[PDB]
């Protein structure tokens, strides 16, 4: 039990470290915002 | 995993005609294009929630 | 000024609120544009 608990805690800590270090991990979630913003921008630009 | 988008609302007259009253009068002759547009946007908006 | 009025600046017709601008136009600039080529600011031909 102690080893399993230690492994789980270490894995959670590594999860936090990886999330903090890697800024591109959440790219799949920034993609939707970028797509919506680009669609709005091209819609606005079409007025010209 | 993404779960929802940004809920967008588009006002026809402001976009197509802006402040032009004559354009707004002319736009009425094209029918219910804007009704369909706003209905679809509203459907997407409720779908996100 | 500070009222929604119909304006005509040298043929530039439109409707909006005219407010004392705070963006530093250079002396050679007499007409501004925002995104989509919309007119954002204009210098008064009578008092500049
Ligand atoms: C505009 O013309 C009037 C009448 O000649 C004059 O009093 C005024 O100073 C002029 N203003 C400018 C900015 O030229």
Curated annotation (Swiss-Prot), chain A:
Residues 1-48 are annotated as: Heptad repeat 1. It comes from the Viruses. Subunit of the fusion protein that is processed upon entry into the host cell. Mediates fusion of the virion and cellular membranes by functioning as a class I viral fusion protein. Contains a viral fusion peptide that is unmasked after S2 cleavage. This cleavage can occur at the cell membrane by host TMPRSS2 or during endocytosis by host CSTL. In either case, this triggers an extensive and irreversible conformational change that leads to fusion of the viral envelope with the cellular cytoplasmic membrane, releasing viral genomic RNA into the host cell cytoplasm. This is Spike protein S2'. The chain holds residues 920 to 967 of 1273 of the full protein.
From Swiss-Prot, chain B:
Disulfide bonds join 12-34, 17-23. It comes from the Viruses. Precursor of the fusion protein processed in the biosynthesis of the S protein and the formation of virus particle. Mediates fusion of the virion and cellular membranes by functioning as a class I viral fusion protein. Contains two viral fusion peptides that are unmasked after cleavage. The S2/S2' cleavage occurs during virus entry at the cell membrane by host TMPRSS2 or during endocytosis by host CSTL. This is Spike protein S2. It comes from Severe acute respiratory syndrome coronavirus 2 (2019-nCoV). The lineage of its organism: Viruses, Riboviria, Orthornavirae, Pisuviricota, Pisoniviricetes. The chain holds residues 727 to 775 of 1273 of the full protein.
């Amino acid at each position: 039990q102690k080893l399993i608990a230690n492994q789980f805690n270490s894995a959670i800590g590594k999860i936090q470290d990886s999330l903090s270090s890697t800024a591109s991990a959440l790219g799949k979630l920034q993609d939707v915002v970028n797509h919506n913003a680009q669609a709005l921008n091209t819609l606005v630009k079409q007025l010209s | 995993l993404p779960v929802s988008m940004t809920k967008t609302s588009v006002d026809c007259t402001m976009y197509i005609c802006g402040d032009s009253t004559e354009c707004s009068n002319l736009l009425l002759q094209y029918g219910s294009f804007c009704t369909q547009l706003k209905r679809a946007l509203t459907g997407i908006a409720v779908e996100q929630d | 000024k500070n009222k929604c009025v119909n304006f005509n600046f040298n043929g530039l017709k439109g409707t909006g609120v005219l407010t004392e601008s705070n963006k530093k136009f250079l002396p050679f600039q007499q007409f501004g544009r925002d995104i989509a080529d919309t007119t954002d600011a204009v210098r008064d031909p009578q008092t500049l």
